[PDB]
Design a protein around this nucleic acid. Structure first.
Lengths: 134, 64, 149, 137, 99, 214
RNA sequence: AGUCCCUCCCGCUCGGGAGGGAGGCACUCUGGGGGGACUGCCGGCGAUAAGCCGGAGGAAGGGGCGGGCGACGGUAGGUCAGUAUGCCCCGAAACCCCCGGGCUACACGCGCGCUACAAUGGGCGGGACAAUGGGACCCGACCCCGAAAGGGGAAGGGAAUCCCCUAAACCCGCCCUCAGUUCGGAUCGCGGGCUGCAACUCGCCCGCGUGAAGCUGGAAUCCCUAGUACCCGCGUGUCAUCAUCGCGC
């Protein structure tokens, strides 16, 4: 038995497969334990800690992430892992725990980049050159 | 000093030169002026049920 | 264990230390007098930077093989300080990469697939896997969460 | 051993609390890169603190500076890759370097080249714009 | 097998041509791979609006979109003869390959 | 340099930074208690959320707010300690990894020096650096009058955090002290109430001016 | 992603990892058609309506978020030097071609920017992660030579098949430890290349050497309300070469 889930953030897409195993979570071929920076590692690891030790050791996950930066990839992996755990467990208690902790774990982030416009487009959409007057 | 806490109960309106200060009604929680309802001016965002620690309670902010 | 199971920096430094004993891998006659890339400012501060570079190249060939000189140059490039002009990314020199790949091939760790690049020989795979597994065995005591992998 | 606070190399006093690279950098005509090159040629660890140098090592450095190319320095890492007069590869230090550069500018001014005229006038020589910048007064 | 590449500046013409090909294929009875829509090629050109330099800078972004579809059809005499006579409107462009 | 166990630290419980808990942290004043957030959260990183929502800062962890505050450049259009600190490419703005590391180091230093919970020390510092009264102009008739006014708890907290961050930046600016060391010193001095802390000095100055214009 | 075969590697293999084949489209994605969000419902204010402030649910609550579309008229606002055009003018000249020079000068005032005045860092070795677009005298993998710039051969790609394309900021280890310095990179010497019929006026690139102001800024003044500002790199238009520039990512 396997379960597949997907997560998206910025421009990063993460596809996660959850199965029964020894609790070895691997991301892009690397163990999750040696992921850097520490902030990204914690971001990826939060759902497992929330779920608990027994479930973490019971199930294992394999994740493939493409696109975006390190933070975006970590967030996408976090979302995919949370969805996979929720679906696999099938219980609503941990689902409510996830909702009250961070509502966006199961619901993706809809924010995207605002297109640039003239008058310093390279700077950004609302950025503009300063006037001189006199 | 240690001041005196007072709980806001009503918002009157904004009465700043640039609309920066808000006028509210507060009741003193403890002290010998406890229970009295006074009207003061507060700077910054404020909601109902907030607690302002007033350095005194002797003066009342005049009506808008 | 596998190269994927351990941090890159520790594995590459260990691999360079091991490669120090391989007679085929020796610095070129111009190694003392050459910067690693056009974007760099001054010469390397390590008297044995050649072995570190060779180890990194071997790991890159292992992970992303087949690879070529141009792609390795792109990887080994970086930002440059152009002075009053804004900084820009630049590639690295190809001589170091070419010589390192030739030396690795002579040692037998890398074999060239025509029109595709350089892949890792089974000998090189065994070498890297052995070093990686000893490194993981060392790391297991320090951190006990890697025992299950 | 005898840790000298001040060491004189090639007629310039070097610091005793500074690594050999940046100590040799104190001599006009040598920078960090060429100092590291000289140390590697001489066989001295570039990172040793200047002051532990012995007489033999100092003399070896002097000889390397006198004839860097013959000691293994690449012909393309020297200060004067092709001498105008002799046609050989040279590396000049301090006073000789100053005299060589002065002689070059003087030769330009003597032949009346554009670069010589601009040198004597004190304006940019390499083709810059002088309308908005280079305001010296 | 035969490869059909159809490109046009309007979606409806491509839809009609693909529907015609699908009708031919289903009438013949041979296996057909549904039209694969390749990524649309959108070319953008930004041009200064003013014909002179005076005035605040403002630009217009002209855009042209080309839509492409791919079809794979089992090669047989009757079907190839039946698809060689497609209407091929003026905007649509058709390319035939055999493999 | 740092031990490999610390480099690859793996938390197992829900506590701030995975190292310090908030069970024993206490807030004394009732004004700031509702807004001072001690919710269990090991990653103080909410991204840009809660900015759009009004009064959405009341549900953001203290450490997250401090990290965001220190993630800045200092100076710009204001002078603290009588100097500008316009650092453009050397600033921490938009570098949450660096801000997080700085806060972690500062908390470690505070814990080592004091022997008490760094979050508790931060709460004490915020309490001691939170002003209570200010001066503002009011327009009546045809002229304006300066009048002393109160400060809402949210503004108190924001001013306290801003003052702490500016003080740390000022005393780390162009010195031998690291930014983390400066932040730890700022928090310690603010908790201890000595005028040496910029936050406490500014609170005293604001209160004195409020009394004068009262 | 699951299933089967082959090859290789490890702790000698309980177990784990990588590549290729057949095979699948399951997930991502591409692109056509539909649904959804409509003050829809609950409480309150407004007059019971116009409407307004909160809450539930929800991906999206109040113009869902960002863009295109700029009315009658005026501004004797800019454009005849983009094209069109009235009158006047030159009409063997102000018309048409060719060579050389200039628009690139430089006591000085100003606009907008890049680089910095350092530790919220400089250098060295190592370790990770994008997107928009472009490609026929064109992009060019891959191989060989060179220390770098760069040189020689050359597969595939008319582009969801090949290339530009393994970005930087960020992370780990070491040196530097507050100093005009291992900050700063102007200004000049020698030497080696690329494009171009032609490189001094007047192009760009790399090696060694050199090492000027600058140690945070007066009055005054400018941008910005969320994936916005700041920080940091990339694509393209100009292009035989040249991007501190405009438009986007």
């Amino acid at each position: 038995r396997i379960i597949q889930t997907t997560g998206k953030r910025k421009t990063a897409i993460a596809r996660a497969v959850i199965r029964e195993g020894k609790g070895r979570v691997r991301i892009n071929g690397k163990p999750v334990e040696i992921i850097e920076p520490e902030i990204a590692r914690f971001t990826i690891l939060e759902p497992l800690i929330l779920a608990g030790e027994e479930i973490w050791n019971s199930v294992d996950i394999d994740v493939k992430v493409e696109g975006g930066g390190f933070m975006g990839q970590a967030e996408a992996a976090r979302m995919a892992i949370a969805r996979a755990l929720v679906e696999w467990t099938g219980d609503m208690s941990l689902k409510e725990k996830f909702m009250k902790y961070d509502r966006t774990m199961l619901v993706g982030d809809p924010r995207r980049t605002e297109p640039h416009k003239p008058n310093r487009s390279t700077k950004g959409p609302r950025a503009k050159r300063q006037k001189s007057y006199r | 000093d240690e001041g005196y806490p007072a709980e806001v109960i009503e918002i009157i309106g904004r009465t700043g030169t640039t609309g920066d200060v808000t006028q509210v009604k507060v009741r003193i929680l403890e002290g010998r002026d406890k229970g009295r309802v006074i009207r003061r001016n507060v700077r910054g965002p404020v909601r109902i049920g907030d607690i302002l620690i007033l350095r005194e309670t002797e003066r009342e902010a005049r009506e808008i | 264990a596998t190269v994927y199971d351990v941090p890159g920096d520790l594995l590459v430094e260990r691999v360079a230390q091991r490669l120090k004993e391989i007679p085929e891998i020796k610095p070129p006659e111009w190694a003392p007098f050459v910067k690693t890339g056009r974007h760099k400012e001054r010469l390397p501060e390590q008297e044995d930077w050649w072995y570190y570079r060779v180890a990194s190249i071997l790991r890159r060939v292992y992970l992303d093989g087949p690879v070529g000189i141009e792609r390795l140059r792109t990887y080994y490039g970086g930002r440059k300080n152009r002075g009053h002009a804004p900084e820009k990314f630049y590639k690295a020199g190809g001589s170091i990469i070419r010589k390192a790949l030739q030396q690795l091939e002579a040692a037998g760790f890398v074999e060239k697939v025509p029109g595709k690049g350089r892949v890792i020989t089974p000998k090189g795979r065994s070498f890297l896997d052995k070093i990686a597994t000893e490194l993981k065995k060392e790391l297991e005591e320090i951190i006990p969460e890697l025992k299950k992998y | 051993a005898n840790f000298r606070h001040i060491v004189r190399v090639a007629g310039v006093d070097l610091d005793g609390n500074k690594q050999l690279r940046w100590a040799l950098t104190a001599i006009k005509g040598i920078g960090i890169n060429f100092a590291t090159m000289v140390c590697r040629v001489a066989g001295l660890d570039p990172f040793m603190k200047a002051g532990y140098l012995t007489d033999e090592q100092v003399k070896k450095i002097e000889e390397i500076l006198a004839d860097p190319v013959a000691h293994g320095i690449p012909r393309w890492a020297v200060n004067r890759p092709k001498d105008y007069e002799t046609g050989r590869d040279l590396h000049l230090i301090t006073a000789k370097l100053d005299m060589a550069i002065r002689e070059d500018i003087m030769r330009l001014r003597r032949i009346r080249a554009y670069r010589g005229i601009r040198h004597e006038l004190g304006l940019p020589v390499r083709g810059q714009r002088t309308r908005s910048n280079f305001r010296r007064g | 097998k035969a490869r059909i590449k159809i490109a046009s500046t309007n979606v409806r013409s491509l839809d009609e041509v693909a529907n015609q090909i699908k009708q031919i294929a289903e009438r013949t009875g041979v296996r057909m791979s549904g039209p694969i829509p390749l990524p649309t090629k959108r070319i953008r050109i930004t041009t200064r609006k003013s014909p002179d330099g005076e005035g605040s800078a403002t630009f217009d972004r002209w855009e042209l979109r080309v839509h492409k579809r791919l079809i794979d059809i089992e090669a047989d005499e009757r079907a190839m003869r039946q698809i060689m006579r497609i209407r091929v409107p003026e905007d649509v462009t058709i390319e035939i390959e055999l493999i | 340099a740092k031990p490999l166990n610390e480099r690859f630290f793996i938390p197992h419980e829900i506590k701030v930074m995975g190292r310090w808990s908030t069970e024993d942290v206490e807030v004394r004043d009732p004004s700031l208690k509702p807004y001072i957030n001690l919710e269990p959260r090991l990653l103080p990183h909410t991204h840009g959320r809660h900015a759009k929502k009004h009064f959405g800062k009341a549900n953001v962890h203290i450490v997250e707010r401090l990290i965001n505050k220190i993630m800045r450049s200092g100076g710009s259009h204001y002078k603290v300690a009588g100097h500008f600190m316009r650092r453009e490419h050397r600033s921490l703005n938009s570098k949450k990894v660096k801000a997080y590391e700085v806060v972690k180091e500062a908390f470690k230093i505070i814990e080592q020096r004091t022997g008490k919970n760094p979050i508790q020390v931060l709460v004490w510092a915020i309490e001691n650096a939170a002003p209570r009264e200010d001066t503002t102009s009011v327009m009546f008739g045809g002229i304006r009058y300066h009048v002393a006014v109160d400060i809402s708890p949210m503004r108190r907290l924001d001013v306290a955090l801003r003052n702490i961050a500016l003080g740390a930046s000022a005393k780390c600016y162009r010195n031998k002290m690291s930014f983390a060391e400066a932040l730890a010193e700022e928090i310690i001095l603010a908790a201890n109430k000595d005028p040496k802390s910029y936050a406490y000095s500014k609170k005293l100055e604001i209160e004195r001016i409020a009394e004068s214009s009262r």
